Symmetry: C4
Subunit: 95 residues, 4 copies
Protein backbone atom coordinates (compact mmCIF):
# COMPACT_ATOMS: atom_id res chain seq x y z
CA UNK A 1 0.00 0.00 0.00
CA UNK A 2 3.01 2.26 0.48
CA UNK A 3 3.76 1.25 -3.11
CA UNK A 4 0.20 1.92 -4.22
CA UNK A 5 0.54 5.36 -2.54
CA UNK A 6 3.99 5.88 -4.09
CA UNK A 7 2.80 5.28 -7.66
CA UNK A 8 -0.09 7.74 -7.47
CA UNK A 9 2.14 10.18 -5.56
CA UNK A 10 4.67 10.17 -8.40
CA UNK A 11 2.01 10.33 -11.14
CA UNK A 12 0.44 13.32 -9.40
CA UNK A 13 3.82 15.10 -9.28
CA UNK A 14 4.40 14.44 -12.97
CA UNK A 15 0.88 15.67 -13.76
CA UNK A 16 1.36 18.95 -11.91
CA UNK A 17 4.80 19.33 -13.47
CA UNK A 18 3.24 19.04 -16.93
CA UNK A 19 0.78 21.83 -16.15
CA UNK A 20 3.45 24.01 -14.55
CA UNK A 21 5.52 23.82 -17.73
CA UNK A 22 2.65 24.35 -20.13
CA UNK A 23 0.98 27.23 -18.29
CA UNK A 24 4.32 28.93 -17.60
CA UNK A 25 5.40 28.76 -21.20
CA UNK A 26 2.21 29.16 -23.25
CA UNK A 27 0.18 31.36 -20.90
CA UNK A 28 3.13 33.24 -19.38
CA UNK A 29 2.66 32.50 -15.69
CA UNK A 30 5.38 32.41 -13.07
CA UNK A 31 6.48 28.83 -12.21
CA UNK A 32 4.80 29.18 -8.82
CA UNK A 33 1.59 30.60 -10.31
CA UNK A 34 1.43 27.83 -12.90
CA UNK A 35 1.71 25.13 -10.23
CA UNK A 36 -0.88 26.85 -8.01
CA UNK A 37 -3.17 27.22 -11.02
CA UNK A 38 -2.65 23.56 -11.94
CA UNK A 39 -3.54 22.41 -8.42
CA UNK A 40 -6.64 24.62 -8.21
CA UNK A 41 -7.88 23.30 -11.56
CA UNK A 42 -7.41 19.55 -11.01
CA UNK A 43 -8.99 19.66 -7.53
CA UNK A 44 -11.89 21.57 -9.17
CA UNK A 45 -11.69 24.41 -6.63
CA UNK A 46 -11.30 26.71 -9.64
CA UNK A 47 -10.93 30.11 -8.00
CA UNK A 48 -10.48 31.86 -11.33
CA UNK A 49 -7.75 34.37 -10.54
CA UNK A 50 -5.49 32.98 -13.33
CA UNK A 51 -7.68 31.47 -16.09
CA UNK A 52 -6.18 30.69 -19.51
CA UNK A 53 -6.36 33.45 -22.11
CA UNK A 54 -5.19 31.75 -25.33
CA UNK A 55 -7.10 29.23 -27.44
CA UNK A 56 -4.30 26.66 -27.17
CA UNK A 57 -4.48 27.24 -23.41
CA UNK A 58 -8.26 26.80 -23.42
CA UNK A 59 -7.93 23.58 -25.43
CA UNK A 60 -5.09 22.21 -23.30
CA UNK A 61 -7.14 22.90 -20.16
CA UNK A 62 -10.05 20.82 -21.48
CA UNK A 63 -7.81 17.76 -21.87
CA UNK A 64 -5.78 18.37 -18.71
CA UNK A 65 -8.98 18.41 -16.62
CA UNK A 66 -10.30 15.15 -18.11
CA UNK A 67 -6.99 13.35 -17.89
CA UNK A 68 -6.03 14.92 -14.57
CA UNK A 69 -9.06 14.77 -12.27
CA UNK A 70 -9.26 11.01 -12.08
CA UNK A 71 -5.59 10.80 -11.05
CA UNK A 72 -5.54 13.67 -8.58
CA UNK A 73 -8.61 12.50 -6.69
CA UNK A 74 -7.27 8.96 -6.63
CA UNK A 75 -4.16 10.24 -4.85
CA UNK A 76 -6.33 12.27 -2.41
CA UNK A 77 -8.41 9.17 -1.58
CA UNK A 78 -5.40 6.89 -1.01
CA UNK A 79 -3.73 9.64 1.03
CA UNK A 80 -6.80 10.00 3.24
CA UNK A 81 -7.41 6.25 3.67
CA UNK A 82 -3.86 4.86 3.86
CA UNK A 83 -1.94 7.74 5.47
CA UNK A 84 -4.20 10.23 7.25
CA UNK A 85 -6.60 7.72 8.81
CA UNK A 86 -4.06 5.37 10.48
CA UNK A 87 -2.06 8.29 11.92
CA UNK A 88 -5.28 9.63 13.44
CA UNK A 89 -6.11 6.23 14.86
CA UNK A 90 -2.58 6.03 16.36
CA UNK A 91 -2.90 9.35 18.21
CA UNK A 92 -5.91 7.88 20.06
CA UNK A 93 -3.61 5.44 21.90
CA UNK A 94 -0.50 6.06 24.05
CA UNK A 95 2.46 3.78 23.34
CA UNK B 1 -15.77 -2.47 -21.38
CA UNK B 2 -14.51 -0.75 -24.53
CA UNK B 3 -18.22 -0.57 -25.35
CA UNK B 4 -19.11 0.72 -21.90
CA UNK B 5 -16.37 3.36 -22.41
CA UNK B 6 -17.60 4.09 -25.96
CA UNK B 7 -21.18 4.80 -24.88
CA UNK B 8 -20.23 7.29 -22.17
CA UNK B 9 -17.59 8.77 -24.49
CA UNK B 10 -20.22 9.49 -27.12
CA UNK B 11 -22.80 10.76 -24.60
CA UNK B 12 -20.19 13.13 -23.18
CA UNK B 13 -19.42 14.48 -26.67
CA UNK B 14 -23.12 15.03 -27.35
CA UNK B 15 -23.51 16.75 -23.98
CA UNK B 16 -20.66 19.17 -24.61
CA UNK B 17 -21.95 19.77 -28.13
CA UNK B 18 -25.34 20.76 -26.71
CA UNK B 19 -23.71 23.33 -24.42
CA UNK B 20 -21.43 24.63 -27.16
CA UNK B 21 -24.46 25.34 -29.35
CA UNK B 22 -26.59 26.86 -26.63
CA UNK B 23 -23.92 29.10 -25.10
CA UNK B 24 -22.66 30.19 -28.52
CA UNK B 25 -26.08 31.14 -29.73
CA UNK B 26 -27.94 32.46 -26.68
CA UNK B 27 -25.03 33.91 -24.71
CA UNK B 28 -22.92 34.94 -27.72
CA UNK B 29 -19.70 33.06 -27.03
CA UNK B 30 -17.21 31.88 -29.63
CA UNK B 31 -17.57 28.14 -30.43
CA UNK B 32 -14.29 27.49 -28.63
CA UNK B 33 -15.27 29.58 -25.60
CA UNK B 34 -18.64 27.85 -25.36
CA UNK B 35 -17.02 24.40 -25.33
CA UNK B 36 -14.40 25.50 -22.77
CA UNK B 37 -17.14 27.03 -20.65
CA UNK B 38 -19.22 23.85 -20.94
CA UNK B 39 -16.30 21.68 -19.82
CA UNK B 40 -15.42 23.94 -16.89
CA UNK B 41 -19.04 23.90 -15.70
CA UNK B 42 -19.76 20.16 -15.88
CA UNK B 43 -16.47 19.24 -14.16
CA UNK B 44 -17.43 21.82 -11.47
CA UNK B 45 -14.08 23.63 -11.77
CA UNK B 46 -16.15 26.75 -12.45
CA UNK B 47 -13.47 29.38 -13.00
CA UNK B 48 -16.01 32.09 -13.71
CA UNK B 49 -14.38 33.96 -16.58
CA UNK B 50 -17.44 33.39 -18.85
CA UNK B 51 -20.58 33.07 -16.68
CA UNK B 52 -24.05 33.35 -18.27
CA UNK B 53 -25.58 36.81 -18.40
CA UNK B 54 -29.16 36.18 -19.58
CA UNK B 55 -32.02 34.66 -17.58
CA UNK B 56 -32.57 31.94 -20.18
CA UNK B 57 -28.85 31.25 -19.88
CA UNK B 58 -29.06 31.14 -16.08
CA UNK B 59 -32.02 28.76 -16.26
CA UNK B 60 -30.42 26.54 -18.90
CA UNK B 61 -27.27 26.31 -16.78
CA UNK B 62 -29.25 25.03 -13.78
CA UNK B 63 -30.60 22.10 -15.82
CA UNK B 64 -27.38 21.46 -17.75
CA UNK B 65 -25.46 21.07 -14.47
CA UNK B 66 -27.97 18.61 -12.98
CA UNK B 67 -28.31 16.57 -16.14
CA UNK B 68 -24.64 16.87 -17.07
CA UNK B 69 -22.57 16.22 -13.94
CA UNK B 70 -23.64 12.64 -13.46
CA UNK B 71 -22.68 11.80 -17.06
CA UNK B 72 -19.39 13.67 -17.21
CA UNK B 73 -18.06 12.20 -13.98
CA UNK B 74 -19.16 8.75 -15.07
CA UNK B 75 -17.00 9.10 -18.18
CA UNK B 76 -14.06 10.38 -16.06
CA UNK B 77 -14.35 7.37 -13.73
CA UNK B 78 -14.51 4.78 -16.54
CA UNK B 79 -11.65 6.56 -18.31
CA UNK B 80 -9.50 6.42 -15.18
CA UNK B 81 -10.35 2.80 -14.29
CA UNK B 82 -10.58 1.14 -17.72
CA UNK B 83 -8.06 3.16 -19.77
CA UNK B 84 -5.60 5.10 -17.62
CA UNK B 85 -5.00 2.41 -14.98
CA UNK B 86 -4.17 -0.56 -17.27
CA UNK B 87 -1.81 1.55 -19.41
CA UNK B 88 0.03 2.57 -16.24
CA UNK B 89 0.21 -1.03 -15.10
CA UNK B 90 1.62 -1.99 -18.54
CA UNK B 91 4.46 0.54 -18.38
CA UNK B 92 5.67 -1.21 -15.20
CA UNK B 93 6.63 -4.30 -17.23
CA UNK B 94 8.92 -4.69 -20.28
CA UNK B 95 7.54 -6.84 -23.10
CA UNK C 1 -37.01 3.57 -6.41
CA UNK C 2 -39.38 6.12 -7.92
CA UNK C 3 -40.16 6.87 -4.28
CA UNK C 4 -36.50 7.01 -3.34
CA UNK C 5 -36.05 9.44 -6.27
CA UNK C 6 -39.17 11.40 -5.25
CA UNK C 7 -37.98 12.01 -1.69
CA UNK C 8 -34.58 13.37 -2.70
CA UNK C 9 -36.23 15.31 -5.54
CA UNK C 10 -38.52 17.08 -3.08
CA UNK C 11 -35.76 17.65 -0.49
CA UNK C 12 -33.59 19.20 -3.20
CA UNK C 13 -36.41 21.55 -4.21
CA UNK C 14 -36.94 22.60 -0.60
CA UNK C 15 -33.19 23.13 -0.19
CA UNK C 16 -32.93 25.39 -3.23
CA UNK C 17 -36.07 27.22 -2.13
CA UNK C 18 -34.46 27.96 1.23
CA UNK C 19 -31.42 29.48 -0.48
CA UNK C 20 -33.53 31.43 -2.96
CA UNK C 21 -35.41 33.06 -0.09
CA UNK C 22 -32.38 33.77 2.05
CA UNK C 23 -30.14 35.15 -0.71
CA UNK C 24 -32.98 37.20 -2.20
CA UNK C 25 -33.87 38.78 1.10
CA UNK C 26 -30.58 39.16 2.99
CA UNK C 27 -28.19 39.63 0.06
CA UNK C 28 -30.65 41.42 -2.24
CA UNK C 29 -30.58 39.16 -5.29
CA UNK C 30 -33.37 38.71 -7.79
CA UNK C 31 -35.38 35.49 -7.20
CA UNK C 32 -33.85 34.01 -10.35
CA UNK C 33 -30.31 35.06 -9.39
CA UNK C 34 -30.71 33.62 -5.89
CA UNK C 35 -31.81 30.24 -7.26
CA UNK C 36 -28.99 30.21 -9.84
CA UNK C 37 -26.52 31.17 -7.13
CA UNK C 38 -27.89 28.45 -4.84
CA UNK C 39 -27.51 25.80 -7.54
CA UNK C 40 -23.98 26.88 -8.45
CA UNK C 41 -22.93 26.75 -4.80
CA UNK C 42 -24.35 23.35 -3.82
CA UNK C 43 -22.98 21.65 -6.95
CA UNK C 44 -19.61 23.27 -6.07
CA UNK C 45 -19.23 24.79 -9.55
CA UNK C 46 -18.86 28.12 -7.74
CA UNK C 47 -18.46 30.56 -10.63
CA UNK C 48 -18.27 33.55 -8.31
CA UNK C 49 -20.33 36.12 -10.20
CA UNK C 50 -22.71 36.59 -7.20
CA UNK C 51 -20.82 35.82 -3.96
CA UNK C 52 -22.29 36.89 -0.60
CA UNK C 53 -21.28 40.32 0.68
CA UNK C 54 -22.67 40.41 4.24
CA UNK C 55 -21.34 38.56 7.29
CA UNK C 56 -24.70 36.90 7.92
CA UNK C 57 -24.58 35.85 4.27
CA UNK C 58 -21.05 34.51 4.65
CA UNK C 59 -22.06 32.57 7.77
CA UNK C 60 -25.26 31.22 6.22
CA UNK C 61 -23.28 30.05 3.19
CA UNK C 62 -20.92 28.02 5.38
CA UNK C 63 -23.84 26.04 6.85
CA UNK C 64 -25.81 25.82 3.60
CA UNK C 65 -22.82 24.21 1.85
CA UNK C 66 -22.28 21.61 4.60
CA UNK C 67 -25.94 20.77 4.95
CA UNK C 68 -26.66 21.06 1.23
CA UNK C 69 -23.89 19.24 -0.65
CA UNK C 70 -24.65 15.80 0.69
CA UNK C 71 -28.30 16.12 -0.36
CA UNK C 72 -27.76 17.66 -3.78
CA UNK C 73 -25.19 15.10 -4.86
CA UNK C 74 -27.38 12.31 -3.56
CA UNK C 75 -30.16 13.49 -5.88
CA UNK C 76 -27.68 13.75 -8.81
CA UNK C 77 -26.50 10.17 -8.20
CA UNK C 78 -30.01 8.68 -7.97
CA UNK C 79 -31.04 10.70 -11.03
CA UNK C 80 -28.10 9.36 -13.03
CA UNK C 81 -28.48 5.74 -11.88
CA UNK C 82 -32.27 5.33 -11.68
CA UNK C 83 -33.49 7.69 -14.42
CA UNK C 84 -30.77 8.61 -16.93
CA UNK C 85 -29.17 5.16 -17.22
CA UNK C 86 -32.30 3.06 -17.93
CA UNK C 87 -33.58 5.55 -20.53
CA UNK C 88 -30.22 5.31 -22.29
CA UNK C 89 -30.35 1.54 -22.17
CA UNK C 90 -33.89 1.65 -23.65
CA UNK C 91 -32.84 3.75 -26.65
CA UNK C 92 -30.40 0.96 -27.60
CA UNK C 93 -33.34 -1.35 -28.42
CA UNK C 94 -36.30 -0.90 -30.81
CA UNK C 95 -39.70 -1.87 -29.40
CA UNK D 1 -21.24 6.04 14.97
CA UNK D 2 -21.86 9.13 17.08
CA UNK D 3 -18.19 8.69 17.96
CA UNK D 4 -17.19 8.22 14.35
CA UNK D 5 -19.14 11.44 13.60
CA UNK D 6 -17.58 13.19 16.61
CA UNK D 7 -14.00 12.49 15.53
CA UNK D 8 -14.44 13.83 12.00
CA UNK D 9 -16.50 16.72 13.38
CA UNK D 10 -13.63 17.76 15.64
CA UNK D 11 -10.96 17.22 12.97
CA UNK D 12 -12.96 19.39 10.58
CA UNK D 13 -13.17 22.17 13.18
CA UNK D 14 -9.43 22.01 13.78
CA UNK D 15 -8.80 22.06 10.02
CA UNK D 16 -10.91 25.16 9.47
CA UNK D 17 -9.32 26.78 12.52
CA UNK D 18 -5.88 26.23 11.00
CA UNK D 19 -6.93 27.98 7.79
CA UNK D 20 -8.65 30.81 9.65
CA UNK D 21 -5.44 31.55 11.53
CA UNK D 22 -3.13 31.26 8.55
CA UNK D 23 -5.24 33.28 6.10
CA UNK D 24 -6.00 35.94 8.72
CA UNK D 25 -2.39 36.40 9.63
CA UNK D 26 -0.42 35.86 6.41
CA UNK D 27 -2.98 37.08 3.88
CA UNK D 28 -4.60 39.73 6.09
CA UNK D 29 -8.22 38.61 6.05
CA UNK D 30 -10.78 39.24 8.76
CA UNK D 31 -11.33 36.18 11.02
CA UNK D 32 -14.77 35.70 9.46
CA UNK D 33 -13.45 36.08 5.91
CA UNK D 34 -10.64 33.61 6.56
CA UNK D 35 -13.08 30.97 7.84
CA UNK D 36 -15.47 31.57 4.92
CA UNK D 37 -12.55 31.37 2.50
CA UNK D 38 -11.32 28.17 4.16
CA UNK D 39 -14.75 26.54 3.86
CA UNK D 40 -15.19 27.56 0.22
CA UNK D 41 -11.77 26.15 -0.66
CA UNK D 42 -12.00 22.74 1.05
CA UNK D 43 -15.50 22.07 -0.33
CA UNK D 44 -14.07 23.02 -3.77
CA UNK D 45 -16.84 25.57 -4.41
CA UNK D 46 -14.02 28.08 -4.93
CA UNK D 47 -15.92 31.29 -5.63
CA UNK D 48 -12.74 33.32 -5.93
CA UNK D 49 -13.69 36.53 -4.15
CA UNK D 50 -10.76 36.17 -1.68
CA UNK D 51 -7.92 34.23 -3.37
CA UNK D 52 -4.42 34.24 -1.84
CA UNK D 53 -2.06 36.96 -3.04
CA UNK D 54 1.31 35.98 -1.51
CA UNK D 55 3.58 33.12 -2.57
CA UNK D 56 3.57 31.63 0.93
CA UNK D 57 -0.22 31.83 0.73
CA UNK D 58 -0.24 30.16 -2.68
CA UNK D 59 2.03 27.39 -1.40
CA UNK D 60 0.07 26.90 1.82
CA UNK D 61 -3.15 26.64 -0.20
CA UNK D 62 -1.72 23.81 -2.31
CA UNK D 63 -1.04 21.70 0.80
CA UNK D 64 -4.21 22.73 2.64
CA UNK D 65 -6.34 21.55 -0.30
CA UNK D 66 -4.61 18.16 -0.53
CA UNK D 67 -4.62 17.55 3.20
CA UNK D 68 -8.05 19.11 3.72
CA UNK D 69 -10.38 17.79 1.02
CA UNK D 70 -10.27 14.17 2.08
CA UNK D 71 -11.21 15.12 5.65
CA UNK D 72 -13.91 17.66 4.86
CA UNK D 73 -15.74 15.40 2.43
CA UNK D 74 -15.49 12.52 4.87
CA UNK D 75 -17.32 14.63 7.45
CA UNK D 76 -19.96 15.64 4.84
CA UNK D 77 -20.56 11.98 3.94
CA UNK D 78 -20.90 10.79 7.56
CA UNK D 79 -23.12 13.78 8.31
CA UNK D 80 -25.41 12.94 5.39
CA UNK D 81 -25.54 9.19 6.08
CA UNK D 82 -25.55 9.05 9.89
CA UNK D 83 -27.37 12.28 10.82
CA UNK D 84 -29.38 13.74 7.94
CA UNK D 85 -30.77 10.47 6.57
CA UNK D 86 -32.20 8.98 9.82
CA UNK D 87 -33.84 12.29 10.80
CA UNK D 88 -35.52 12.37 7.39
CA UNK D 89 -36.67 8.80 7.79
CA UNK D 90 -38.08 9.68 11.25
CA UNK D 91 -40.20 12.56 9.93
CA UNK D 92 -41.98 10.05 7.66
CA UNK D 93 -43.57 8.39 10.71
CA UNK D 94 -45.72 9.85 13.53
CA UNK D 95 -44.77 8.74 17.05
K1 LIG E 1 -15.86 21.57 -7.44
K1 LIG F 1 -15.42 24.93 -8.16
K1 LIG G 1 -14.57 31.24 -9.51
K1 LIG H 1 -13.95 35.90 -10.51
K1 LIG I 1 -15.05 27.70 -8.75
Amino acid sequence: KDKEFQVLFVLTILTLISGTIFYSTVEGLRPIDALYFSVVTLTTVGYGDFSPQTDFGKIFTILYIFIGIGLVFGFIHKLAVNVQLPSILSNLVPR
